[PDB]
Amino acid sequence: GSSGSSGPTKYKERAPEQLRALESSFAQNPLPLDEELDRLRSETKMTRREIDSWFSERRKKVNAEETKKSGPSSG
Structure with missing residues (x-):
């Protein structure tokens, strides 16, 4: 799993x-x-646990970024 x-x-x-x-x-x-x-x-070259963590840390970052406010920065 x-x-x-x-x-x-x-x-x-x-x-x-x-x-x-x-x-x-x-x-x-x-x-x-x-x-x-x-x-x-x-x-x-990572393990299921390693990769899994990434997504949970990435997919979450893209969901927060682009804040309604005007913040012209990395993504």
């Missing part, structure tokens, strides 16, 4: 190579299944 929970909030920027594979997958779905994850794991 899929599972991944984190306590405190950290700040880590994924690599340019790992993302390329992730960002590409995201488009399809924010929470990909194991199968689809097995493939990405090859490029991202």
Whole structure:
């Protein structure tokens, strides 16, 4: 199955190579299944728990960004 929970909030920027594979997958779905994850794991070189965390940390970032207010910044 899929599972991944984190306590405190950290700040880590994924690599340019790992993302390329992730960002590409995201488009399809924010929470990909194991199968689809097995493939990405090859490029991202991470574990189900690692990747799973990303999405939950990414898909959530894109949902907050672009705040109604006028804030011209990274995304």
